[PDB]
């Protein structure tokens, strides 16, 4: 709640950032045959659920029409969407709190509220603009720019109201207040695009040739090999001393990362098979149950993805600690976190030259949980009749697969 004077759009994104990614976009693909000729249909409807935040878009319109220096008064940060059809809400008590701090500033001459048309009731909308005109009367050096609540006929809960006569009812002050404001109508259509992320767009693909489960099988059969996933597992089982010891940790940390990258590509294959087998809900439950039991040791059971992060920051710390103290290089590797983090993959492997006395082992449950998934999605291939190659895939992940389809979806 501190007013700050900026000068351009590049100054705004430095201190405040950009817009919120939209969550209401859907993409549909359909393959058809018309007398022996192929036909592909791409359908992206306009979203009915939008983000209620409009501040970054309004500053783009201001600088494009000749604006100069202005003041920014934040009222809070963005809230998250609960799901794909419930956007967050705008509170009346935050916007009125922002009007109280701008009363103490001397230099601005114009008052605006860019998020105000997405307020829950129209009575809150008119009451906010009645407060701005009372501030313009008291300080007697400012002016207010108003809009209507909507550009079309809107529902009040009891009645339907036209926008122009409803604004004339809501603003109920005398002339000594009305001379400080002006109102404009209707809304304007711009050249700007919505802000979105390609990591959150899911494709639904209906094709006459169904190979969704077969393409999901070929990736998962290939990763279940001796050179692929078995080669990851058998590898795991003064100033010159610190520099040699950092080379040993970098080889272990490089082995963990390709195991985590193998975990990422498995989940994209099973998710496309879960979404394709909407028929026979008992088979979808078995495929979903096999996936979370494989994801136990990676996230839920043991801290496999958590030790790969702390070892990297512990690796940087030991290279800076060599400037002053050897006890610093002793307190970490024996007493504090560094001796404790190695125990979770192998607890007492130091009993011999080879890893023995396997009290704790986060590995070697991978291949048992993998071939369970291979049989579980094997029941799904005679029950899927309509879903094609890209069903259930993220939009960013199809760019290496089919580049021409990815560019066509971006235009729509």
């Amino acid at each position: 709640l501190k007013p700050k004077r900026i000068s351009s759009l590049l100054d705004f994104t430095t201190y405040y950032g950009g817009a919120q990614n939209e969550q209401g976009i859907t993409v549909k693909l359909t393959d058809t045959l018309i007398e022996g000729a192929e036909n592909r249909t791409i359908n992206v409807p306009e979203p009915t659920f939008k983000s209620p935040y409009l501040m970054f878009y309004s500053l783009q319109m201001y600088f494009a029409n000749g604006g100069g220096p202005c003041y920014i008064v934040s009222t809070g940060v963005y809230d998250d969407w609960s799901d794909s059809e419930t956007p967050p809400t705008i509170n009346f008590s935050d916007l009125e709190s922002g009007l109280a701090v701008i009363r103490k500033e001397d230099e601005p001459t114009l008052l605006l509220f860019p998020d105000a048309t997405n307020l829950p009731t129209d009575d809150e909308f008119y009451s906010l603009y009645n407060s701005a005109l009372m501030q313009c009367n008291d300080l007697q050096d400012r002016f207010t720019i108003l809009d209507t609540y909507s550009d079309q006929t809107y529902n009040d809960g009891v009645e339907d109201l036209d926008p122009i006569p409803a604004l004339r009812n809501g603003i109920n002050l005398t002339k000594d207040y009305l001379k400080y404001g002006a109102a404009y109508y209707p809304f304007v259509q711009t050249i700007l695009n919505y802000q979105y992320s390609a990591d959150e767009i899911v494709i639904q693909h209906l094709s006459y040739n169904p190979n969704a489960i077969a393409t999901a099988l070929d990736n998962l059969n290939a990763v279940n090999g001796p050179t692929f996933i078995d080669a990851i597992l058998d590898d795991l089982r003064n100033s010159v001393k610190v520099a040699n010891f950092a080379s040993l940790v970098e080889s272990v940390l490089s082995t963990l990362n390709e195991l985590i990258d193998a975990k990422e590509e498995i989940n994209k294959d099973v998710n496309s098979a879960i979404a394709s087998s909407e028929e026979d809900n008992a088979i979808k439950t078995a495929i979903s149950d096999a996936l979370d039991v494989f994801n136990e040791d990676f996230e839920g059971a043991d801290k496999i993805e958590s030790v790969a992060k702390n070892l990297s920051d512990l690796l940087i710390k030991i290279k800076q600690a060599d400037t002053n103290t050897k006890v610093e290089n002793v307190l970490s590797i024996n007493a504090l976190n560094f001796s404790a983090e190695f125990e979770k993959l192998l607890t007492y492997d130091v009993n011999t030259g080879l890893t023995a006395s396997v009290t704790l082992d986060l590995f070697a449950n991978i291949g048992t949980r993998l071939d369970d998934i291979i049989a579980a999605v094997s029941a799904a291939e005679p029950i899927d009749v309509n879903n094609g190659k890209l069903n259930g895939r993220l939009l960013s992940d199809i760019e290496p697969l089919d580049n021409a389809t990815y560019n066509t979806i971006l235009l729509e």
Binding site: P120, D123, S127, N130, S131, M134, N137, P165, R168, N169, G170, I171, N172, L173, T174, D176
Partner: protein
């Protein structure tokens, strides 16, 4: 839960409007033909015909009405005291200027 609103008696909104008009125009200006903030509607509708026995009465005990008008919103429409047939003391602004 937030769709339910509070209904209040109007005496504390009137006190705020007394201080707003005295600062703008003085204490000798009647506090009527003015608007109220944070108010959606009156709770009861009062027409033209039933305000007549509110404003002028044989006892002299006048009651000021809060009303709605098309194109103007909710307003205070009445500026009398409870000695409403007195030629010296029937207006609120005369009594408060003497005070």
């Amino acid at each position: 839960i937030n769709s339910h609103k509070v209904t209040l008696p109007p005496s504390s909104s009137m006190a705020g409007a007394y201080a707003r008009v005295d600062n703008d125009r003085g204490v000798w200006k009647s506090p009527a033909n003015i608007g109220l903030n944070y108010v959606s509607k009156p709770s009861v509708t009062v027409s033209h015909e039933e305000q007549e026995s509110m404003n002028v009465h044989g006892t002299g005990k006048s009651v000021n009405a809060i009303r709605s008008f098309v194109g103007k919103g909710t307003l205070v429409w009445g500026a009398r005291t409870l000695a409403g047939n007195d030629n010296e003391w029937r207006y609120i602004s005369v009594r408060r200027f003497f005070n």
